[PDB]
Curated annotation (Swiss-Prot):
This is Endonuclease V. The record marks 86 as: Interaction with target DNA. The keyword Amino-acid biosynthesis does not apply. Highest levels detected in liver with high levels also found in heart, kidney and testis. Expressed at low levels in brain.
Amino acid sequence: AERPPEETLSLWKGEQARLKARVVDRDTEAWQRDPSFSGLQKVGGVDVSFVKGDSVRACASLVVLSYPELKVVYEDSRMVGLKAPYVSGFLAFREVPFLVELVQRLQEKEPDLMPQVVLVDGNGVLHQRGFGVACHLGVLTELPCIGVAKKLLQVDGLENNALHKEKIVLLQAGGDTFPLIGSSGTVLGMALRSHDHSTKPLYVSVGHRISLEVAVRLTHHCCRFRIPEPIRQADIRSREYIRRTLGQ
Ligand SMILES: [K+]
Ligand SMILES: [Mg+2]
């Protein structure tokens, strides 16, 4: 509903700094150091869709897909009540509690389908304070997480200016990338052209327990369309559930 007061945003910033010390930005799973990701069998995807008329009602979805076939083997959607509006840089405080609850519900119902990695709609370390929603989910669940964003977060001097759009033009095939370098010189993420018949890139960053190069290549391998299939299937389910709720 209402934008949070400065007292709340300060506490949220403090919480992000405390948790950021737990981010692991290298590979820690045997399949991640395999040239073909042999051993990777389950890739997760999450989405939260907010109802057009209601600032309280939302639908959170978790899917698990087989790898490499990308078939849905687990799905869960839930209507939830929002506690916070969208504020850029504080996305996790609007939705990460629902995602954690979705992972806990999977652990109770189908523990053998726990994903080995989760694609999250939104940034990881490409973030105002280096701790976006993909890092936040990763630290709370200890699952490997990848941040996949559909627009460029303009932090650390990153801009969607004419030079950025030129670089996008040079991305000519599915799988082409260019690095996102902050003013500090740090590599924050990668722009990725995710398939041959899309021109607007994805922006991929490390969430937790994965390296950037592995994060980018896996994201590419999950793309049948622009949006990686685990996120895409969670989107589809969240919106269908909202539709059926309003009657349709
Ligand atoms: K989402
Ligand atoms: Mg989505």
